[PDB]
Amino acid sequence: PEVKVNFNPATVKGSQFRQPLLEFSGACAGCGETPYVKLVTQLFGDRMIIANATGCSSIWGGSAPACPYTVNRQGHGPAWASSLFEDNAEFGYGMALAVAKRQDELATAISKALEAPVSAAFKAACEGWLAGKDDADRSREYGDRIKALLPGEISQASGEVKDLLLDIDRQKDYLTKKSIWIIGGDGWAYDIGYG
Amino acid sequence: PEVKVNFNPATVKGSQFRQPLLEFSGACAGCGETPYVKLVTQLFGDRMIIANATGCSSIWGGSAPACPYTVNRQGHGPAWASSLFEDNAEFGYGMALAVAKRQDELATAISKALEAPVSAAFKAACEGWLAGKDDADRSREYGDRIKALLPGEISQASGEVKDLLLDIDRQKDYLTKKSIWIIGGDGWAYDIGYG
Ligand SMILES: Cc1ncc(C[n+]2csc(CCOP(=O)(O)OP(=O)(O)O)c2C)c(N)n1
Ligand SMILES: Cc1ncc(C[n+]2csc(CCOP(=O)(O)OP(=O)(O)O)c2C)c(N)n1
Ligand code: SF4
Ligand code: SF4
């Protein structure tokens, strides 16, 4: 079973107690690429999206039908996508625009929830999230309180107030701030995708 | 008529006594672009090839049926070409490869001319050109001596020796070293063509 430990994730020993979310890929024995991505998944894999350029990182990272990126016990893990060899930077840039747009729709539904007859504990977590929606730790902190209070709050609501809470529940996957990562080889970064 | 003067071309006064090879373009009144290219034509227009990106410099520089680039009294002037907006640097890079290839074919025909029964004055200019074929001034100096001696040399030759001199006459336009210039706007250089 999982064991909650307070080892500092900023150290080598503390980081390896986190579950790896990149495992058993098709890279060569002793590859110099996969250890880097594996460490990133152990630190921020809970909330990251990957835009991967075509290359080795896309061949051992995304050759059908096997996917080396996995999830933790909570079912959360990095979402992985590879478009083309030359557009990987702009591909990931587009994701950052969209993810910000999805969080903006949620913040609007949360601000409207403040004006609705909902529980005082629910209003407390919403105000805390709006102030730290762009902070990785704070958005996870107040977001989880919102996720925990939503099912009981929806049961106690009705009419258009219930629809407002149901719209927040539909977008609760954008409470936690995401981390966009654009991964590629030197051939992509130094040549075809440098522009 | 043309007046040979020994004013230093490196000064402003000396450069303007050279004939401009960019005249009467379609640029705006007081454009900040055309004065730059005009000065380049007055210095090296005798032996330059232009790879121009799409933009203002291609619209006032190459809108049919009027061409603003002209020639001097000797009939020599810049050759101008525009491929696309995004490839102008590689377009001009390809020209530099080809021009070097054309000079290489000429140097082979000149080295073979040293082994042929030709005039002593012709052999003197060929040895001088081979040593300075990559120097702008020296290649023009010894090249013009070769161009001046060729018609009399061809008249005095026969057989395969005459064919060797006729092959040099076919390539005499690559004695003088060329100057490849890649002209474009900031939109080309900073964005789409920066890679
Ligand atoms: C537009 C385009 N050009 C070329 C290719 C072929 N291609 C696939 S991967 C690759 C190079 C990978 O080198 P690098 O970016 O350094 O990644 P690495 O494999 O070294 O990790 C190339 C040229 C392609 N798929 N698409
Ligand atoms: C592939 C492509 N994209 C866009 C264009 C349209 N286009 C023509 S000129 C130009 C911009 C010119 O700006 P700049 O490079 O700064 O030159 P300037 O006109 O300022 O001298 C653009 C976007 C094109 N012709 N081709
Ligand atoms: S980068 Fe590619 S080829 Fe090189 S060791 Fe890793 S998997 Fe093998
Ligand atoms: S750059 Fe183009 S638009 Fe600007 S002054 Fe020159 S010709 Fe006119």
Side-chain angles (χ1 to χ4, degrees):
Chain A
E2 189 175 2
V3 173
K4 308 175 182 180
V5 71
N6 287 331
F7 265 105
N8 186 12
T11 65
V12 177
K13 176 175 179 175
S15 67
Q16 292 314 301
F17 281 139
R18 299 294 171 86
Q19 172 183 352
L21 300 180
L22 170 68
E23 57 183 11
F24 321 139
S25 72
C28 300
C31 178
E33 288 190 352
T34 56
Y36 290 108
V37 181
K38 185 185 73 66
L39 178 57
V40 178
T41 64
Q42 292 170 312
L43 298 176
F44 330 105
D46 196 20
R47 49 181 198 81
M48 66 190 253
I49 304 172
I50 299 178
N52 209 125
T54 312
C56 267
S57 46
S58 77
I59 294 305
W60 58 251
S63 289
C67 176
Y69 295 91
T70 188
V71 299
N72 55 13
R73 291 178 178 281
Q74 291 76 37
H76 301 346
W80 192 91
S82 178
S83 184
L84 301 172
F85 185 28
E86 67 275 24
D87 71 339
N88 192 46
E90 316 90 296
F91 188 47
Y93 171 79
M95 301 180 178
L97 295 180
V99 173
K101 279 298 179 185
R102 299 277 58 76
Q103 194 191 53
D104 185 20
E105 188 191 352
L106 176 60
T108 297
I110 290 182
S111 292
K112 285 181 174 171
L114 295 181
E115 310 294 324
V118 295
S119 302
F122 195 92
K123 297 186 181 180
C126 291
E127 293 173 351
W129 183 93
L130 294 172
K133 58 183 178 69
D134 292 18
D135 182 302
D137 299 306
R138 286 179 49 203
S139 67
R140 177 197 304 273
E141 179 183 3
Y142 294 106
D144 295 341
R145 297 183 187 183
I146 297 175
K147 296 178 183 177
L149 299 172
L150 264 180
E153 205 68 275
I154 296 176
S155 175
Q156 299 298 320
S158 59
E160 297 178 314
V161 181
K162 184 177 180 178
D163 295 337
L164 178 56
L165 289 171
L166 288 171
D167 192 45
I168 304 179
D169 178 81
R170 188 184 58 90
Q171 313 177 31
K172 66 176 174 292
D173 52 339
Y174 290 100
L175 291 163
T176 302
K177 184 179 187 180
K178 310 311 177 194
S179 185
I180 298 305
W181 280 83
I182 302 175
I183 303 179
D186 66 287
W188 157 77
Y190 286 71
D191 295 333
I192 188 174
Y194 173 59
Chain B
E2 189 175 2
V3 173
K4 308 175 182 180
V5 71
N6 287 331
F7 265 105
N8 186 12
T11 65
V12 177
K13 176 175 179 175
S15 67
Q16 292 314 301
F17 281 139
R18 299 294 171 86
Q19 172 183 352
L21 300 180
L22 170 68
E23 57 183 11
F24 321 139
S25 72
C28 300
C31 178
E33 288 190 352
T34 56
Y36 290 108
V37 181
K38 185 185 73 66
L39 178 57
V40 178
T41 64
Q42 292 170 312
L43 298 176
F44 330 105
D46 196 20
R47 49 181 198 81
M48 66 190 253
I49 304 172
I50 299 178
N52 209 125
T54 312
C56 267
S57 46
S58 77
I59 294 305
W60 58 251
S63 289
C67 176
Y69 295 91
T70 188
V71 299
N72 55 13
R73 291 178 178 281
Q74 291 76 37
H76 301 346
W80 192 91
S82 178
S83 184
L84 301 172
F85 185 28
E86 67 275 24
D87 71 339
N88 192 46
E90 316 90 296
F91 188 47
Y93 171 79
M95 301 180 178
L97 295 180
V99 173
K101 279 298 179 185
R102 299 277 58 76
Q103 194 191 53
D104 185 20
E105 188 191 352
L106 176 60
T108 297
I110 290 182
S111 292
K112 285 181 174 171
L114 295 181
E115 310 294 324
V118 295
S119 302
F122 195 92
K123 297 186 181 180
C126 291
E127 293 173 351
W129 183 93
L130 294 172
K133 58 183 178 69
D134 292 18
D135 182 302
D137 299 306
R138 286 179 49 203
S139 67
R140 177 197 304 273
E141 179 183 3
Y142 294 106
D144 295 341
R145 297 183 187 183
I146 297 175
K147 296 178 183 177
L149 299 172
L150 264 180
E153 205 68 275
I154 296 176
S155 175
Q156 299 298 320
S158 59
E160 297 178 314
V161 181
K162 184 177 180 178
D163 295 337
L164 178 56
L165 289 171
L166 288 171
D167 192 45
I168 304 179
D169 178 81
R170 188 184 58 90
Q171 313 177 31
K172 66 176 174 292
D173 52 339
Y174 290 100
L175 291 163
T176 302
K177 184 179 187 180
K178 310 311 177 194
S179 185
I180 298 305
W181 280 83
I182 302 175
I183 303 179
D186 66 287
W188 157 77
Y190 286 71
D191 295 333
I192 188 174
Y194 173 59

